[PDB]
Design an enzyme around this catalytic site. Structure first.
Site, PDB file in Angstrom:
ATOM      1  N   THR A 243       0.839  -1.232   0.000  1.00 49.03           N
ATOM      2  CA  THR A 243       0.000   0.000   0.000  1.00 49.03           C
ATOM      3  C   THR A 243       0.862   1.267   0.000  1.00 49.03           C
ATOM      4  O   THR A 243       1.975   1.292   0.535  1.00 49.03           O
ATOM      5  CB  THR A 243      -0.947   0.015   1.230  1.00 49.03           C
ATOM      6  N   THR A 244       0.339   2.307  -0.625  1.00 44.12           N
ATOM      7  CA  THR A 244       0.916   3.640  -0.546  1.00 44.12           C
ATOM      8  C   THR A 244      -0.193   4.670  -0.317  1.00 44.12           C
ATOM      9  O   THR A 244      -1.114   4.790  -1.133  1.00 44.12           O
ATOM     10  CB  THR A 244       1.652   4.024  -1.852  1.00 44.12           C
TER      11      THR A 244
ATOM     12  N   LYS B 254      -8.893   2.954  -0.008  1.00 49.42           N
ATOM     13  CA  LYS B 254      -8.017   3.253   1.107  1.00 49.42           C
ATOM     14  C   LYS B 254      -8.097   4.705   1.576  1.00 49.42           C
ATOM     15  O   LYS B 254      -7.390   5.062   2.520  1.00 49.42           O
ATOM     16  CB  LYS B 254      -6.591   2.886   0.745  1.00 49.42           C
TER      17      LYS B 254
END
Lengths: 203, 227, 227, 227, 227, 227, 227, 227, 203
Positions: free
Chosen positions: I1-2, I33
């Site tokens: 994830t970023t 997210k």
């Protein structure tokens, strides 16, 4: 992390740096590690940030309450004794922290409290990964007879040395002076920077 | 006997035991608060009652924190317990959120505590009314709160024996946004208007707070300049 | 004495203490709601009662969330506690399922809380009635709920002192699917019909919601245009 | 005063407070159920009571699951709470065993809940009677259940104000194994026989279930064809 | 008022509330049991009460397990709860030891449950008497058990309205070790002797068990052969 | 009967049962305390009452710690329990903080314990008043505390039968900052002024503490020098 | 009404409800015990009461273990519960220490259980007296124990309706260290002396134990030899 | 009715139910204790009451440990429970600290247990007084303790019916530091002085302890030498 | 994830990517997210999906309730302090997450909270496996003086870089801008894609 607290004849000087790391990864360069927790009381935090931050809030609440209930500020040794009991009560599921508590009641005081609730008073104390470097500077250069200006310079030097040799320490140096006369004053950034230049230093 | 148990309604839908708790409040000495220009203040009469008492000690205005204060009227021991609840409740909020955004919620928590004691048998109500005044993120606030758990926000109000005298006087003379010194004078006048004539007002308690500051308690000599 | 205990039935199968709780509701000022074209609204009279009160504060319409509102009548402290329950209960449902499909179930949970307090000794009933209005996945909804825990869904209804005046007026004049402005007018008329003649209706509270939108609270100047 | 406490027997061995709860049931509008050829049905009169009510909402027949329904008569809030209990209790059994073999046991669990509230001081009985009808592995079932926790299985029965009229009529006219349409007609007749003459039966609720199917609720227009 | 609370003794050492519970038992229809040659039986009159009731359902003899049965008289809901307790209690013993060596101990556990409800305030007694009959390792057993928790073992006994008629008749006519059919006849005679003359005994329930066998319930047609 | 239950207010907002607890205090022998120059003292009359009693034992002044003492008046057993609470409470504070900065808070904790017993049914109030005197970080302190949980700080005060005699005498004769010996004399005089004339004051208890010291209890012979 | 609650003393320091429990004991049939040469015995009259009862079953002497027995008089169900407590209590001691050194302590535990029920509201006392007799490491023991929890050790005593007759007879005729057969005879005589003349003593229960042996229950034919 | 509930104060600040508990003590037989030269003793009259009782058993002086004893007067069952509490409480202190430094604290713990039962509704007080006598690290001690939880230390005191006779006699004749035999004689005299003349004192119980020794109980023949 | 959150003079920009993996196995390419949790407040989630998703729902609920009770939005620092307390309360059975909380009250703010409740404010912050790559781009290219349009471009670049070098990151870039004037606006997909083209990039 590097925090320090020193005592002089009628003052207490507390300082920290501001780096927050997850291992070698510098996530935040300006976290806060020095807090006012009462009229003439300050606290520095090292260790697990979550545990420290919760304790800061509890101490603010508990000392504000005490002061309204008693109409006097909690004695500095009483603050240390309170932390001592809280941390020891939960020693097997501890607050993973090192705390410095500094202030003036009838006299100046600095206390160092550990994660099992052990609390010891001392004329000076340092905490965090950078503390051994601070202890070096202070052993060599600290005098009881120092003036508040000399003390502020001394802690700036100690933390600057720790920043140079502890990768877990870095960022702006952050200083508070505590006197009966003016209370807990946090020095402004212009002024700290100015002395960094006058002493000939970096970060 | 619709009269003897906190849990019994009268046939008209009244809770007389709560209404009696309210009569306890009337036996207390008068206190008042009013909003003024960027601030709020409290004045409390003190039934001074012997030179053998310590004056600088036991007194009706109590700080809840640096930005919020209360005066009470009614049963003293009940008042003390409620002021401690107010103080703890304030600190709980400060620990949870970091600050006290809206004083109304502190007051509601105290008012809820009081309402409880009007609904479950086995307890009596608190025989207390409170005024709360402070600065929050909305601005300067002034609430009262009675034994029933009833809350109201005011520009000015009073509690205690002289309530009605002080309220009708303020209904006539009160103006919004006075400077502090005029506010205090108006207050001292209103309080005086509630005494039996041929009865002198002795030194009351006065506390004020203006936006961007902490509370200050007037000391006796500052107060006398208004007498 | 079939009259003194929430747990005692009269020989005719009545619970008088519950019926007395219901008399508490009658002492509240009148409020009403009606469904209109793709929406529902609430209007509440406010017994305005002194210029020293803060008006823009303490007020009878309360949002439960962005899509559901309530008015109450009766004991104020009881009302406050029930509105808080409604709010928490609403959020519990939202956390469990992600949304509030049928407003009826929120109202039932509040009504169940109330019914409990009519069956176990040691507590008194809440002296409160509520109207709930909002939009859900069925459509625009309007419920009331009384001290007994009794629920009904309506096209239009009222609570408080002027209930019967407002209800018979609506029984005569009400029509389904009015546009919003006509609905509000009808409401203001109905409310006026419940006053002692030679008694002027001051500015009431009005809130509305229409399908695919959030609630809006009319501000004073928008309301005056109907007075 | 053998009369005032659920835990007191009269000298003749009576529990008058339970008997009074039973008078609450008589204030409800009449409902009835009967077994017919491979099935069972419910009909409920609805005291229709204002055009401002939402009709298609609040109504006395309630599905407990797809195969079991209940009508209630008495205190509405009590009835609601008991229907919810019935529903949860049904699902508990389904989760434990995978199905509901004998409807009698669901009814017993509800009746036991009710009997409890006739034996421990600190509570009042539920002022409700219920009829339960459905299909299970034994066949089509029809039970009633009163405030005392008393259960009986019937071929046909009724609850509410018009109980006795409807029961004596059925005692005369009832026959086993009627086709559904004749059963419904007999039911509508029986219900009519309980009204004050010069009083018209408005549209009642009707639900039926036949072996190997789920319940169906008759809609208004299907019902009118029998009026 | 030595009369109103289960926990109050009269000055003569009586517990009238327990004695009143006992009057509840007298309003039940008569049932009886007797030991015979290698066996024990139960006969229960059924106050048959409408053709709309389901007969083959609700009925007074209940199996506790395959070797032990009970009849009750008094408050029906109370009886149901006690029969369930008896059943669960029996299985608890079976799980602990693998079998039920002495039926007396099952009965004692039920009787102890009942005695409790005659000693702690906050509850009323059960308005029920039970006869228990079955085979165990001692032999064929017959106990009764009343609202006080009082137990006795019998050769023959009865409970309900006709108790005294049935008991005095058996005191005259009863003999030990009859064959089953003669035992049943004697029982039917005894039961008949308790009716108001010009009142016909309708089909009663009959259940019997003989050493080395399980209980059998007589079906209606087998019973009629004795009427 | 507004008179019989700690939880019942009278229609004037009184708690008579608390007020009756207060009458218990009047049956105790008089004790007093006064602040003097850098110190505070306590004097207690002892109703001496038989040569068979051990004098040097049971006695009214009790040390709470080395710097704080209390005298009580009223029900002895109650007093004992409250003095123990005071002692434990003191040590809890000492363990939490390392010292007892403000004696006012110890007193408040005792007063709160007492207030509780005036609000929850199921307990009676303590029939005791206490005077607390000691040195803390504010200075020399003197409080009293009554059955209601009411606290006050004084320069001088008394409790017990002779309260009013001793208080008016002190209202006349008392002066601040006396040396210890003059304070004690004034005290002995005040106490004597409350006796029935032709009644001799026997040896009382005297304890004193001055800043930077621990409490000292005067022994009998030191006391006699003032008689 | 010093009469109606186990927790209320009369102005003379009496607990009438405990004294009434004691009247319950008087309604029981007489039983007695006496120490003799190296032993102790129990005799119980049995109010024989119908040929339909099973005699060899329900009976007043009960073994607590092999070395300790009890007779009871009063409420039967209460008696049963207390004998079970005695039995369990005995085994607890045996498990803790390996044996029962002093029977007095078993009796005290039962007496304590009984005393509890004379001190806490919400329960009534047990309406039972017990005699306990057995051999322990001190020797042969004989105690009684009443509803108050009062214990006494005797050489001989009785309980039940005929207590006073049997006690004054034994006060006259009793001698220590009789052989068993003479002891039994003396007992039968004493028991007979308590009957209404023209009333025959039917077969009583007799149990005895002598040092170094277990209890033996006399069978009917051994008993008749004394009648 | 300021008279019926342990938790109700009379308008004069009395607890009559506690005072009535105290009358229970007056119905016990007299006992006394006195300090003498390096020791303390107890004498108890025993209402001897039938030759059928076992004398060497049930008796009023009870050892709490080897160095501390108690006599009681009042309700016997209550006394037994309190003596057991005293014994357990003594052993708890011994386990915690290794010894019992000050007997006063043991007595306080028993007195506190008693005071509790004068403050919480739902219990009655103990109808018992105790005298405690023993040697501790302070010296020889003598305390009494009543139903209120009131404690006093004495040189000599009594409890029971003859209290006042015995106390005034000792007020006249008592001297400190008598040798043991003279102390016993004085005690016997005092006890005799409380009897109705023409009434002989039968053998009482006597126990003594002197510094550096354990308690000894005088046997009957040693006691007679004083009669 | 970023995930990333930056602050500008009167704005907050928050962005994420959408990949959800179980180890190397890309199970979902468009998970969410980035969430609005109040009128002027947004939250990004990294870490254990279940724990994150629960917390998103709690915060929506708790802030909606607060707002109705107080008639003002929760201060952004208050939201961070709340999460701080919640996560620390359960530190030994933790929510295994990293949270960013961003919004406007009297000023713009971004807070980073860890699984032990440690919360630190910063001018920018990034979370998830791809965060070190974002920190690279931001150190080199972030200016306080950037315009909102420049900020949006900057975060798109940072997340694109992270996508290129962190296999745990991927999918459509998802951007929200938060201003006093327009509130929390989630940029539309047309617009993000358009700038990906104009900047010359991929996925």
């Amino acid at each position: 992390t590097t925090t320090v607290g020193i005592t002089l004849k009628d003052a207490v000087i507390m300082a920290t740096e501001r780096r927050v790391t997850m291992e070698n990864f510098i996530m935040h360069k300006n976290g806060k590690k020095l807090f006012q927790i009462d009229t003439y009381t300050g606290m520095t935090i090292a260790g697990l940030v979550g545990d420290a931050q919760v304790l800061v809030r509890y101490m603010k609440a508990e000392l504000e309450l005490y002061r309204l209930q008693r109409r006097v500020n909690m004695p500095i040794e009483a603050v240390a004794t309170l932390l001592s009991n809280m941390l020891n009560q939960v020693k097997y599921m501890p607050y993973m922290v090192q705390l410095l508590v500094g202030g003036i009641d009838t006299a100046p005081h600095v206390f160092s409290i550990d994660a099992a609730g052990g609390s010891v008073e001392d004329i000076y104390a340092s905490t965090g990964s950078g503390s051994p470097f601070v202890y070096g500077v202070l052993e060599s250069q600290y005098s009881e007879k120092m003036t508040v200006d000399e003390g502020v310079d001394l802690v700036i030097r100690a933390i600057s040395a720790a920043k140079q040799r502890d990768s877990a320490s870095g960022g702006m140096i952050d200083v508070a002076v505590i006197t009966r006369k003016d209370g807990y004053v946090q020095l402004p950034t212009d002024q700290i920077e100015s002395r960094i230049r006058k002493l000939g230093l970096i970060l | 006997a619709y009269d003897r148990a906190i849990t019994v309604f009268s046939p008209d839908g009244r809770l007389f035991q709560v209404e009696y708790a309210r009569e306890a409040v009337k036996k207390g000495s008068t206190a008042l608060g009013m909003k003024f220009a960027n601030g709020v203040l409290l004045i409390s009469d003190k039934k001074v009652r012997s030179r053998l008492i310590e004056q600088n000690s036991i007194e009706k205005i109590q700080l809840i924190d640096d930005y919020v204060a209360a005066v009470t009227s009614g049963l003293v021991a009940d008042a003390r317990v409620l002021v401690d609840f107010a103080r703890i409740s304030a600190q709980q909020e400060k620990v949870t959120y970091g600050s006290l955004v809206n004083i109304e919620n502190l007051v509601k928590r105290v008012a809820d505590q009081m309402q409880q004691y009007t609904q479950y048998g086995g307890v009596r109500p608190y025989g207390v009314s409170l005024i709360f005044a402070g600065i929050d993120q909305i601005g300067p606030r002034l609430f009262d709160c009675d034994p029933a758990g009833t809350i109201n926000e005011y520009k000015a109000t009073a509690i205690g024996s002289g309530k009605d005298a002080v309220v009708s006087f303020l209904e006539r003379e009160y103006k919004e946004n006075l400077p502090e010194k005029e506010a205090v004078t108006l207050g001292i006048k209103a309080l005086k208007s509630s005494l039996e004539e041929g009865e002198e007002l002795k030194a009351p308690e006065i506390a004020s707070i203006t936006v961007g500051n902490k509370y200050r308690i007037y000391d006796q000599e500052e107060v006398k300049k208004f007498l």
